[PDB]
């Protein structure tokens, strides 16, 4: 019903950094999963990372991407983040079992689980 971030799994970026990078991509989304990332990532005490103007790109049902502080940050299916250059990690998927995957440049950075 109401998606909430429950777990951030990391295989370098911390759990909170992954949330903040993904939220920068997802900042203006109306999609409930993206809004859940944004909510979880709010940090009133931090200099908010922002996507570069005009770089947000999305293919509905597959994922989104933007440049955040000079990094290509992807948020979406495993196929989406691999297509954008991340190398796979079978353990990350197994550790996770909705879910989204996070790529940062050529790195598969994280998986986020929602309940
Ligand atoms: N970061």
Author numbering: 606 to 616, 626 to 711, 717 to 734
Excerpt from the publication:
P-type ATPases are transmembrane proteins that play a key role in the uphill transport of a wide range of cations across membranes using the energy provided by the hydrolysis of ATP, being crucial for the ion homeostasis in nearly all organisms and for heavy metal detoxification. HMA1 and HMA6 are found in the inner membrane of the chloroplast envelope and HMA8 in the thylakoid membrane. Here, we present two structures of the nucleotide binding domain of HMA6 and HMA8, the former at the highest resolution, obtained for any P-type ATPase structure. The overall structure of HMA6N-AA and HMA8N (respectively) exhibits a twisted, antiparallel β-sheet made of six strands being flanked by two pairs of short α-helices, one on the concave (α1 and α2) and one on the convex (α3 and α4) side of the sheet.
HMA6 represents the main route for copper into the chloroplast, also supplying the Cu/Zn superoxide dismutase, while HMA1 represents a second route for copper, crucial under high light. The initial construct (HMA6N) of the HMA6 N-domain was poorly expressed and required the addition of an N-terminal solubility enhancing tag, which lead to a 15-fold increase in expression. Modifications of the construct and the buffer remained unsuccessful and therefore the construct sequence was analysed using the Surface-Entropy-Reduction prediction (SERp) server for patches of surface residues, which, once mutated, could potentially promote local stability, and the three highest scoring mutants were tested for expression and crystallisation. One of them, the double mutant EE709AA, dubbed construct HMA6N-AA, led, together with a change of the buffer, to an initial crystal hit. A reduction of the protein concentration to 4 mg.mL-1 occasionally led to crystals with a different, more wedge like shape and a different space group (P22121), not showing any more the inter-grown clusters seen initially. These crystals diffracted up to 1.5 Å resolution and contained only two molecules in the AU. Glu709A, in the partially disordered helix α4, points to the solvent and the glutamate of the wild type sequence, when modelled in the structure, clashes with the side chain of Leu705 of the symmetry related chain A*. On the other hand, the side chain of Glu710 points towards the centre of the domain and would clash with Val730 of β6. Several crystal contacts are present between the chains in two axis, while these mutations allowed for a crystal contact in the third axis, between α4 and α4'. An interesting observation in the case of HMA6 is the presence of glutamate 672, not commonly found at this position, pointing to the nucleotide binding cavity and guiding the position of the conserved H645.
